[PDB]
Amino acid sequence: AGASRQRKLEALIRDPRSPINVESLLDGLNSLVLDLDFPALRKNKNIDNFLNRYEKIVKKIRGLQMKAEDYDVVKVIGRGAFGEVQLVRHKASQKVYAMKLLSKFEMIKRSDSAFFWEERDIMAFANSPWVVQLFYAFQDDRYLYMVMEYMPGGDLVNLMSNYDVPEKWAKFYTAEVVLALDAIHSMGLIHRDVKPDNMLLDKHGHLKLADFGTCMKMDETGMVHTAVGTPDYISPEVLKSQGGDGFYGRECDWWSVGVFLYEMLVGDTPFYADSLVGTYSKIMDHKNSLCFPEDAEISKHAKNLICAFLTDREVRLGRNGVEEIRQHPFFKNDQWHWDNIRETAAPVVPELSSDIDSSNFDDIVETFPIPKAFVGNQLPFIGFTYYR
Amino acid sequence: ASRQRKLEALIRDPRSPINVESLLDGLNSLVLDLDFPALRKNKNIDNFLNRYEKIVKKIRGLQMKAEDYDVVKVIGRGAFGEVQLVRHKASQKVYAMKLLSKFEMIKRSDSAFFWEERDIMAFANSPWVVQLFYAFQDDRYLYMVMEYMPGGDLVNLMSNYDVPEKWAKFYTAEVVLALDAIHSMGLIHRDVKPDNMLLDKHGHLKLADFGTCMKMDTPDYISPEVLKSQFYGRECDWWSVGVFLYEMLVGDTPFYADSLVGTYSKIMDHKNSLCFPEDAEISKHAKNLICAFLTDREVRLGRNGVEEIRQHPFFKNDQWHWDNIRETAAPVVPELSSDIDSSNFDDIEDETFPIPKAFVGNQLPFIGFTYYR
Numbered sequence: 001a002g003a004s005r006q007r008k009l010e011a012l013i014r015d016p017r018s019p020i021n022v023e024s025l026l027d028g029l030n031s032l033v034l035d036l037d038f039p040a041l042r043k044n045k046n047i048d049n050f051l052n053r054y055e056k057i058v059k060k061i062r063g064l065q066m067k068a069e070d071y072d073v074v075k076v077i078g079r080g081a082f083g084e085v086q087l088v089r090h091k092a093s094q095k096v097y098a099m100k101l102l103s104k105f106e107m108i109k110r111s112d113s114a115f116f117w118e119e120r121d122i123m124a125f126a127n128s129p130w131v132v133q134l135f136y137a138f139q140d141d142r143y144l145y146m147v148m149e150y151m152p153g154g155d156l157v158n159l160m161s162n163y164d165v166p167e168k169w170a171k172f173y174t175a176e177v178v179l180a181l182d183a184i185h186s187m188g189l190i191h192r193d194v195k196p197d198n199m200l201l202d203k204h205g206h207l208k209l210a211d212f213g214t215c216m217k218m219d220e221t222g223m224v225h226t227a228v229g230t231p232d233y234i235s236p237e238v239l240k241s242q243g244g245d246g247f248y249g250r251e252c253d254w255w256s257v258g259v260f261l262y263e264m265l266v267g268d269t270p271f272y273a274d275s276l277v278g279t280y281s282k283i284m285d286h287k288n289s290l291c292f293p294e295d296a297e298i299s300k301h302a303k304n305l306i307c308a309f310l311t312d313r314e315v316r317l318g319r320n321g322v323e324e325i326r327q328h329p330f331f332k333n334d335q336w337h338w339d340n341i342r343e344t345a346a347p348v349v350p351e352l353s354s355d356i357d358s359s360n361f362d363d364i365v366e367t368f369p370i371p372k373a374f375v376g377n378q379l380p381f382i383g384f385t386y387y388r
Numbered sequence: 389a390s391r392q393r394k395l396e397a398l399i400r401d402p403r404s405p406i407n408v409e410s411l412l413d414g415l416n417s418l419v420l421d422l423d424f425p426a427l428r429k430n431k432n433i434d435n436f437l438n439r440y441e442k443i444v445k446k447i448r449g450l451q452m453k454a455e456d457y458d459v460v461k462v463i464g465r466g467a468f469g470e471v472q473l474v475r476h477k478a479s480q481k482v483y484a485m486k487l488l489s490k491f492e493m494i495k496r497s498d499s500a501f502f503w504e505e506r507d508i509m510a511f512a513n514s515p516w517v518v519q520l521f522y523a524f525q526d527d528r529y530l531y532m533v534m535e536y537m538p539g540g541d542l543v544n545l546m547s548n549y550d551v552p553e554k555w556a557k558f559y560t561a562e563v564v565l566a567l568d569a570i571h572s573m574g575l576i577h578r579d580v581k582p583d584n585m586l587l588d589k590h591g592h593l594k595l596a597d598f599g600t601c602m603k604m605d606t607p608d609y610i611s612p613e614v615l616k617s618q619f620y621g622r623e624c625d626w627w628s629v630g631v632f633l634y635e636m637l638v639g640d641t642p643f644y645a646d647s648l649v650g651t652y653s654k655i656m657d658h659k660n661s662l663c664f665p666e667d668a669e670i671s672k673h674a675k676n677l678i679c680a681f682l683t684d685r686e687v688r689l690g691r692n693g694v695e696e697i698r699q700h701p702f703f704k705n706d707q708w709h710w711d712n713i714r715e716t717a718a719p720v721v722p723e724l725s726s727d728i729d730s731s732n733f734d735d736i737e738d739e740t741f742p743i744p745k746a747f748v749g750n751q752l753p754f755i756g757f758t759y760y761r
C-alpha cells in the first residue's frame with residue numbers, strides 16, 4: 001500500500017536513533033547554509049537564490065535552537081584531546097551541567113572526526129547509572145557541545161591524592177568499575193581508556209565512567225580495529241596492535257582494572273617509569289617487570305586479583321564474562337552485594353557548599369578560512385544535534 | 389520548551405519551508421548534488437555520502453515517484469515539459485500529471501514560476517481551480533499530480549459547437565468566478581485563454597496553467613498594457629474575458645490578423661479596430677459587456693472588483709444565479725466511454741545536466757517542491 005510506505009517513512013523520522021530524524025534533518029539544512037553562504041560561492045545563481053529563499057527561516061531556527069549563549073560558563077574543569085569540559089549553568093532553568101566542547105577545526109585538521117558519534121550515543125542511550133548521561137547535544141559553526149550530568153565528587157586521581165586508600169574502599173570502587181564496564185560491554189562497546197581520570201564520583205560518592213571518545217563498537221566476534229594518549233593504563237596487546245594491524249577486544253578494559261587496583265593499594269602505577277618509552281617497555285615486559293613492593297599493605301586475594309588481570313590476554317580474567325570476576329574472594333565483604341552496591345553508603349560522600357562547588361577538581365583558537373569553492377566542513381557533523 | 393514548541397509548530401505547518409518533506413528534499417538534493425566521483429575526492433563529501441547512502445536509497449524507494457504511475461497518453465505539451473494522463477498503479481486512480489524539465493528550467497527559465505503554480509493548485513480549495521493532489525521530484529523532473537479534466541478545453545468546445553448566447557453567458561460567468569477566486573488569493577493569471585479553461589466530468593469549468601502567475605502587492609488574448617510594458621494589475625485578466633466572449637459569440641478572434649505584428653497593431657488600436665461583423669447576431673448587452681472589457685486599463689470593467697461585472701444585465705437568466713451556477717446543469721455534458729477517455733483532447737507528436745567537475749547545486753532551486761496530501 002501507498003499509505004503503508006508513508007507509515008514506514010514516518011517511523012524512520014520519529015525514531016530518535018535514526019540518521020534522518022528531525023534534528024538531523026535540521027542539521028542537514030543548517031550545515032548546508034553554513035557551507036554555502038560565502039560571497040564568492042554566491043556568484044553561482046543556484047546557491048544565491050537558495051540562500052535568499054532560506055535566509056529568514058534559518059535565522060529563525062538559529063535563534064530558537066539551543067546554543068552556547070543559553071549557558072553561563074562558570075569554570076573550565078578539564079582539558080582534553082579536541083577541547084575541554086566546562087562547568088555551566090543553564091540561564092533559564094538555573095540548573096548546573098558539565099558541558100564538553102570539541103573543536104570542529106582541530107578534528108578536521110587532525111582527521112580524527114568520527115569518535116564523537118559513539119561518545120554521544122553511549123551517553124544519550126545507555127540509561128545506566130554507571131554511564132554519564134547526555135541531556136543535550138548541539139552545535140555551532142566552530143564547536144560540538146555535549147551537555148551532561150555534572151559529577152561533583154571529582155575523579156579517582158583526586159581521591160587517591162587526598163586519601164591513603166584502604167583495601168575495603170578499593171574493593172568498593174573496583175567493584176563499581178567492574179559493573180560499569182560490564183554494562184558498557186553488554187551494550188557491545190569497549191572503553192579502551194579505563195583510568196582513574198575517567199572514573200567520576202556523583203553527589204553521593206558513587207562511580208560513573210566518562211570520556212567515551214575512544215569507544216569502538218565490537219563486531220560479532222567481540223573485537224575492534226586507533227591512537228593513544230598516556231600509556232600507564234594501556235594493555236600490551238593494545239601497544240603491539242598500534243604498530244602492526246592486530247585486533248583486540250574487551251579484555252583491554254579488564255587489564256586497566258588490574259592497573260587501577262594496583263594504583264589504589266600501592267600508591268604508584270605498576271609499570272611506572274620517568275619517560276613514556278620506559279613505561280611502554282615495562283608494560284611489554286609485564287611477566288618480569290610487575291613487582292609488589294615489600295612495604296605495600298596488600299592482601300593475598302588482592303595480589304591474586306591484580307595478577308589475574310595483568311597477564312597475557314589468552315589467560316586473562318574477563319575473557320569468559322564478568323561472573324568469574326564477581327566470584328573472586330577479594331570481593332567478599334560485609335557491606336554490599338553485586339545487585340545493590342550502588343544503593344549502599346559510599347566510602348566518601350562529597351560535602352559540597354553550593355551547586356557550582358568544583359572543589360574536588362583542580363584549577364585550570366583558529367577557524368576555517370573563507371573558502372574559494374564548496375568544501376563541506378560542516379558535513380561531518382550533520383546528525384549531532386540531540387534534544388532529549 | 390516554549391522555543392521547542394515554536395520550532396515544532398513551524399515543522400508541522402504544510403506551508404512552511406522547513407516542513408518534513410522540504411527537509412527530506414534538502415537531504416535528497418544535497419546527496420544528488422554531492423555524489424559524483426570527482427567531488428568525492430573531498431573526504432568531507434565522501435564520508436558524508438557514506439553515512440547517508442543507505443538511508444537515502446531507502447527513502448527514495450518509499451517516497452512517491454514516476455514509476456508509481458502508468459503513462460496512458462500525453463494530453464498536452466508546453467514551455468519546459470508536458471501533461472500526461474496517468475493511472476496510479478496501486479490505487480488505480482486516474483490523474484493528470486505535469487512534468488517539468490529541471491535542466492531546461494535552469495538553462496532558459498529566468499524565474500521560479502513553479503512555486504506559485506504548485507501553491508495555487510495545492511491550497512486554493514476552490515472548485516474553479518484545478519486541485520493538486522501530489523507534487524514530487526526525481527533528479528531530472530518536477531511532477532504535479534492534478535485532477536484530470538475529461539471534458540476538454542474551450543477551444544475544443546468552440547470548434548465542435550456553434551455557441552449560443554445562453555451557453556456563452558454560462559461559461560463567461562464561470563470564468564468570472566474562477567478569476568475572482570484567483571484574484572481573491574492575491575494572484576493574477578496573466579494567460580487567460582480558452583486553452584487554459586478546462587471542463588470536468590460534469591461540463592463545469594476550471595482554470596489551469598498557473599505557470600505565468602505573479603503575486604500582487606500567443607498574442608490573440610494579450611492586453612495592450614502588457615504589450616507596452618515589455619507594471620500592471622488584475623484588469624489584464626479581465627481583458628481576456630472580453631476576448632473570450634467575442635470569440636465564442638462571433639467564431640473569430642476580435643483582433644485576428646495574418647502576422648503577429650498585425651495582431652499587436654490591431655490590439656493597440658482597439659478603440660477603432662474592435663468591430664462586430666454585421667451578419668453575426670449579437671445582443672446589445674453582449675456587445676455592451678465585450679466593449680466594457682475591451683477598453684484602456686484605467687476605465688476597464690473589473691478594476692472596481694467583481695461586483696460591477698456580476699450586476700451586468702447580460703448575465704440575467706432563468707437557469708442559474710451566481711451563488712449556484714456550479715450546481716446547475718452544464719450546457720455540454722461530456723459523453724465519456726471510460727475513466728481514460730481523452731477524446732475531447734487532440735493527439736500530440738514528439739537532454740540533462742553534465743556531470744560536473746565541482747559543486748554546482750542544480751537540485752537546490754527545487755528543495756521544497758515535494759507536497760503529499
Ligand SMILES: O=C1Cc2cc(-c3ccnc4[nH]ccc34)ccc2CCN1c1ccccc1
Pocket residue numbers: 077078079080081082083084085098100101132148149150151152197198200210211212213
Ligand atoms: O571527557 C573527558 C573526561 C572529563 C570529564 C569531566 C567531568 C567532570 C564532572 N562531571 C562530568 N560530567 C561529564 C563529564 C564530567 C571533566 C574533565 C574531563 C577531562 C577529559 N575529558 C575530555 C576528553 C576530550 C576532550 C575534552 C575533555
Ligand SMILES: O=C1Cc2cc(-c3ccnc4[nH]ccc34)ccc2CCN1c1ccccc1
Pocket residue numbers: 463464465466467468469470471484486487518534535536537538584586596597598599
Ligand atoms: O499546464 C498546461 C495546461 C494543460 C492542461 C492539461 C490538462 C488536461 C486535462 N486535465 C488536466 N488537469 C490538470 C491539467 C490538465 C493538458 C494540457 C495542458 C497544456 C499546456 N500546459 C503546460 C504548460 C507548461 C508546461 C507544460 C504544460
